[PDB]
Amino acid sequence: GLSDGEWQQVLNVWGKVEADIAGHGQEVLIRLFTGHPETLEKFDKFKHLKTEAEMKASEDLKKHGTVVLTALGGILKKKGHHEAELKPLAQSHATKHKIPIKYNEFISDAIIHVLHSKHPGDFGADAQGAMTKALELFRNDIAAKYKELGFQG
Ligand code: HEM
């Protein structure tokens, strides 16, 4: 999937996200919600936010941010050996939350954006390459599980 050199890059970048999981989590979800308003409708607890200020002022949104990035970090530290960690995720987003694979695409892009925004100039081309490949692997493995379930939509 990835070489050990590329995994090394991913984990180096992840070190930036661990220094402020809540600020990073928050900005990823705001970037998603503002850029793709339909994603907001999948969250009954956040569908009430209409402005970004409101979003920025929501402590519950920062909390969910932490939950998401904690789960992602766990998976990335497995360097592709994440079947155990991913099956459950895949299963709940397909059967319970009914999240199209496309939104995983969106959040993937929103991570890259936020890293460039918070770390201008020290999110290099090699680092971007490794991070993108890692997210792709994650997305691909999810998609495999969605297929088994026939979560067509
Ligand atoms: C980077 C990928 C993602 C990660 C690691 C992630 C992680 C999580 C985790 C750990 C939970 C709580 C446990 C569970 O319900 O399985 C959760 C809940 C949820 N996720 Fe995700 N998620 C991701 C992507 C998304 C996307 C793209 C959407 C929607 C556009 C989404 C929608 C939801 C919803 C609606 C819930 C339930 C929230 C609640 O009411 O508490 N997830 N997610």
CA pseudo-torsion sign 52, 129, 83, 147: positive
Residue 10: partners with Cβ closer than 8 Å, 6 or more residues away? 2, 76, 130, 131, 134
Atom from ligand 1 closest to the CA of residue 103: 27
Q: How determined? A: X-ray
How many CB atoms sit inside 10 A of residue 151's CB? 19
Protein residue whose Cα sits closest to atom 14 of ligand 1: 92
H helix runs in the chain, sequence order: 4-18, 21-35, 37-40, 52-56, 59-76, 83-91, 101-118, 125-149
> Are 24 and 9 spatial neighbours (Cβ–Cβ below 8 Å)?
no
DSSP 51: S
- Which of 99, 105, 137, when mutated, tests ligand 1's pocket best, judged by the most ligand atoms within 8 Å of its CB? 99
113 is in an annotated binding site: no
CATH number at residue 9: 1.10.490.10
Integer CA distances (angstroms), 142 to 47, 79, 83, 88, 152, in order:
25, 15, 10, 10, 13
How many CB atoms sit inside 10 A of residue 10's CB? 21
> Are 135 and 111 spatial neighbours (Cβ–Cβ below 8 Å)?
yes
Q: How far is residue 13's CA from residue 67's CA, in Å, rounded to a whole number? A: 19
Q: Which domain holds residue 33?
A: 1-153
Determine the distance from the C-alpha atom of residue 16 to the mean position of all C-alpha atoms in its chain, rounded to a whole number: 15
Atom from ligand 1 closest to the CA of residue 104: 27
Query: How far is the centre of ligand 1, averaged over its atoms, from the C-alpha of 69 (Å)?
Result: 10
Atom from ligand 1 closest to the CA of residue 111: 1
DSSP 123: S
81 is in an annotated binding site: no
Number of domains within the chain: 1
Q: Nearest to residue 68, comparing CAs of 37, 101, 100, 110?
A: 110
Q: How far is residue 18's CA from residue 52's CA, in Å, rounded to a whole number? A: 24
Protein residue whose Cα sits closest to atom 6 of ligand 1: 68
